[PDB]
């Protein structure tokens, strides 16, 4: 079981650069968060601010999920991120991207499941 | 913070003992979790079992709060409680209470949490 929320802090959460190294980042990060097994992974984005202000855009702006859902949401301001792109030359097990840095605003989908009890009502 | 998963925890939770040692235990646990503080809370409930146990029922039956509110759940199993009530001769700052162990099906108000990122959509 790998939660969705550690797959995504994984596949998308780097606070240890402001910015993508080089060129070589993409190909470093997608070999290293694993996304380059069995297949490369054609498209991710990496973003370089605090996993708190990424997990507040769960209470920002609120818009579409580009496949029909309504659990997205978008980030106020902008972000350092990271677009990493499946290039041309790319062949499964030599997987090659592209690096991109940008600031723009992301848009993720904000899930959960934990309920707590916070206060005790009745017994019966 | 103290959240208010903390505040229901430390006045609801005992999974130390699963029944009440004596009749005592009240006057002890309601002084201890600093229920008796300011003034004396003239009912509450502990229960033993585990916090696992507790949380879980957040996603188990619906049933309607005292007060009008919906967000209250009932647990599917009855649990190991013990009802804490001010006694006749309780008088801040000495509270009295009189201890009842029983097995009962129990009923919390649930402020359940969704806030996490599980999918990034696009960026704009």
């Not at 605090?50 to 902008?78: E, F, I, P, W």
Request: hydrophobic share 25%.
């Amino acid at each position: 079981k790998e939660s969705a929320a550690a797959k995504f802090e994984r596949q998308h959460m780097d606070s240890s650069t402001s910015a993508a190294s080089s060129s070589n980042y993409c190909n470093l990060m997608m070999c290293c968060r694993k996304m380059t097994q069995g297949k490369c992974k054609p498209v991710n984005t990496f973003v370089h601010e605090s996993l708190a202000d990424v997990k507040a855009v769960c209470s920002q702006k609120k818009v579409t999920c580009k496949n029909g859902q309504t659990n997205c949401y978008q980030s106020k301001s902008t972000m350092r991120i990271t677009d990493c792109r499946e290039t041309g030359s790319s062949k499964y097990p030599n997987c090659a991207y592209k690096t991109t840095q940008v600031e723009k605003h992301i848009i993720v989908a904000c899930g959960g499941k934990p309920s707590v009890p916070v206060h005790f009502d009745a017994s019966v």
